[PDB]
């Protein structure tokens, strides 16, 4: 089962689990109140999976590619890794389906406290436009992820503060409507 938790107060070593003590787990239902949605798939089948196709058609995920984050293969690795972990938002959904390996997507809750989401092979997530978030590898230091997009992609991050954007305003309005 996909795991998420409130983070501790240490600012060192982003790749460690950083579980708050005592444990404060976060449920998929609480994540939905933040607009964060999740599906579980068989990642071995990703090249030809009717279940993935059902989600892509439902959600209008008409575009995809594959990215591999590995200290060796990935160009500008050190710079990209730093960028990924900077708190930012996008004006579009951020949709990621983990094909191999694992990593952490952190999101702000309604009180602007960090929640860490542990994503592993088979896990698919969408972070809504406007949500403040960041990504890091975990201590296994490897992930292969499918990126999906509603139409032709724009990857631009806006590092916090980015509060003026319509996407952020609309997201804040969405938050008023959930539990």
Sole residue written with tokens 């406290």:
113
Beta carbons within 8 Å of 1's beta carbon, 6+ residues apart:
none
**Any binding-site annotation on 90?**
yes
- How far apart are CB 131 and Ni ion at their closest, in Å? 9
Rg (C-alpha) for the chain, rounded Å, is 16
Applying CB under 5 A, which residues contact Ni ion? Answer: 94
- How far apart are CB 153 and Ni ion at their closest, in Å? 12
Residues in the chain, total: 179
**H/E run at residue 171:** helix 166-176
Which residue lies nearer to Ni ion by CB, 87 or 109? 87
**Any binding-site annotation on 94?**
yes
**Any binding-site annotation on 164?**
no
Sole residue written with tokens 């575009």:
63
Which tokens belong to 164?
A: 């003026």
96 strand-pairing partners: 125, 147
- How far apart are CB 125 and Ni ion at their closest, in Å? 11
**Any binding-site annotation on 53?**
no
Which residue lies nearer to Ni ion by CB, 25 or 161? 161
- How far apart are CB 69 and Ni ion at their closest, in Å? 13
89 strand-pairing partners: 158
Which residue lies nearer to Ni ion by CB, 94 or 123? 94
- Position of minimal CB gap to Ni ion: 94
Which residues sit in the known binding site for Fe(2+)? 88, 90, 94, 133
């Amino acid at each position: 089962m996909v795991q998420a938790w409130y983070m501790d107060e240490s600012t060192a070593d982003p790749r460690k689990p950083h579980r708050a003590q005592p444990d404060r787990p976060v449920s998929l239902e609480q994540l939905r109140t933040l607009g964060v949605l999740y599906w579980k798939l068989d990642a071995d089948k990703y090249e030809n999976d009717p279940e993935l196709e059902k989600i892509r058609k439902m959600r209008n995920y008409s575009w995809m590619d594959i990215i591999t984050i590995c200290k060796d293969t990935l160009p500008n690795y050190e710079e990209k890794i730093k960028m990924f972990f900077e708190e930012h938002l996008h004006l579009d959904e951020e949709i990621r389906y983990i094909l191999e390996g694992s990593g952490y997507f952190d999101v702000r809750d309604k009180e602007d406290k960090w929640i860490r989401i542990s994503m592993e092979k088979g896990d698919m997530i969408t972070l809504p436009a406007g949500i403040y978030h960041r990504f890091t590898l975990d201590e296994k230091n490897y992930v292969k992820a499918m990126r999906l997009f509603v139409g032709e992609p724009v990857w631009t991050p806006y590092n916090r503060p980015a509060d003026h954007f319509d996407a952020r305003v609309q997201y804040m309005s969405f938050l008023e409507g959930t539990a």
